[PDB]
Amino acid sequence: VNSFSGYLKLTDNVYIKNADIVEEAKKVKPTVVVNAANVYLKHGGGVAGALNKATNNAMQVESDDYIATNGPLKVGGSCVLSGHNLAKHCLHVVGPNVNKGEDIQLLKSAYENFNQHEVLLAPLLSAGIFGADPIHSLRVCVDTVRTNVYLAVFDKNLYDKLVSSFL
Numbered sequence: 001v002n003s004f005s006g007y008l009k010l011t012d013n014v015y016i017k018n019a020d021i022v023e024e025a026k027k028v029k030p031t032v033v034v035n036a037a038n039v040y041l042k043h044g045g046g047v048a049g050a051l052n053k054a055t056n057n058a059m060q061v062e063s064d065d066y067i068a069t070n071g072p073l074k075v076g077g078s079c080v081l082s083g084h085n086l087a088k089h090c091l092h093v094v095g096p097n098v099n100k101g102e103d104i105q106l107l108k109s110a111y112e113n114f115n116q117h118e119v120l121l122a123p124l125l126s127a128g129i130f131g132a133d134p135i136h137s138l139r140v141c142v143d144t145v146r147t148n149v150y151l152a153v154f155d156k157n158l159y160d161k162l163v164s165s166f167l
């Protein structure tokens with residue numbers, strides 16, 4: 001039993017809700033919140049900009065030190081950093097950004113990072129400003145993640161379409 005509330009169960013291990021991931025994280029304080037990161041950990045907009053703003057830019061400060069030490073992530077890769085005031089940890093995961101021409105096949109590799117964590121609060125990878133089809137992202141999530149994932153979908157219209165079209 002966990003404290004995630006109001007989710008629709010899609011499969012044995014995948015759950016979904018129409019919610020703002022920032023407000024969800026502040027309420028639940030999950031062990032892991034997933035960020036929709038880019039390889040530079042530049043948290044300018046989308047989910048990343050919102051999560052970072054909620055940390056009063058502390059996420060960006062920590063991320064800049066991470067990059068200065070380690071260099072950029074790989075598309076499809078991840079790193080674990082602090083969750084600041086939102087969660088114990090933040091798993092920064094880089095899905096492919098279609099608006100940069102990146103290979104959508106890397107979406108499966110991106111979701112594989114979730115399997116290193118027993119329970120996660122997460123957005124749909126490569127959705128929103130990353131330009132991929134969110135219906136496809138949900139399909140890849142369900143077919144790749146085996147650990148317990150709680151998906152927050154900001155857009156109510158999109159949430160209803162994701163549920164209604166889910167096979």
Ligand SMILES: C[C@H](CNC(=O)c1ccc2c(c1)CCC(=O)N2)C(=O)O
Pocket residue numbers: 020021022046047050123124127128129134152153154155156158
């Ligand atoms: C399928 C799409 C992808 N978009 C996101 O995951 C997303 C985008 C921007 C923000 C948030 C989530 C949280 C609150 C916020 O301030 N910004 C959806 O979830 O609606």
